[PDB]
Structure 1
Amino acid sequence: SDDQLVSMSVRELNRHLRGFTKDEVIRLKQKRRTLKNRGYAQSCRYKRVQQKHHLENEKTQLIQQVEQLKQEVSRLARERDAYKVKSEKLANSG
């Protein structure tokens, strides 16, 4: 209360609450519920920020992948053109 109450367990809890005032059995469970909800919000906020960075990282790595392929296209264009000229210049061999 409030730190051994969230960390405490489903049975262990009911062991510590066996003869408890039946209106304070409800109050303590309400209290713990609320404290956990606070921790869920903390995860939810956290998960959101992690997904956001993950999405932006994916965007970055697609951008640099495009860049790689841009470099290859230009190499291959040149290599093809080296042969196309070579090919055409032989064909005028006459």
Structure 2
Amino acid sequence: LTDEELVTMSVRELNQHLRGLSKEEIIQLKQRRRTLKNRGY
């Protein structure tokens, strides 16, 4: 689950892994993934 991965892994594919992460650990990941899609990556 690297950074460049959060992107390659469509949200749907991401929400797939999150399955098991508390509601707080889910928000921490729902952020960067949104940043990469915008950054140079």
TM-score, normalisation: structure 1: 0.37
Counterpart Cα distance in 1 of 2:10 and 2:38: 16
Identity of aligned residues (%): 70
Runs of 4+ with deviation above 2 angstroms:
none
Determine the structure 1 residue equivalent to 2:10.
9
Q: Rg: which structure is higher?
A: 1
- Alignment RMSD, CA only? 1.7
- Structure 2 gap segments, 5+ residues each: none
Counterpart Cα distance in 1 of 2:14 and 2:26: 10
Structure 2 counterpart of 1:11, one-letter code: R
Indicate conservation of the 8 Å contact 2:6/2:33, yes or no: yes
**How many Å apart are 1:36 and its aligned residue?**
1.3
Determine the structure 2 residue equivalent to 1:22.
23
Structure 1 counterpart of 2:14, one-letter code: L
**How many Å apart are 1:24 and its aligned residue?**
1.5
- Indicate the structure whose relative CO is greater, using CA pairs within 8 Å and at least 6 residues apart: 2
Corresponding residue pairs, total: 40
TM-score, normalisation: structure 2: 0.71
Determine the structure 1 residue equivalent to 2:38.
37
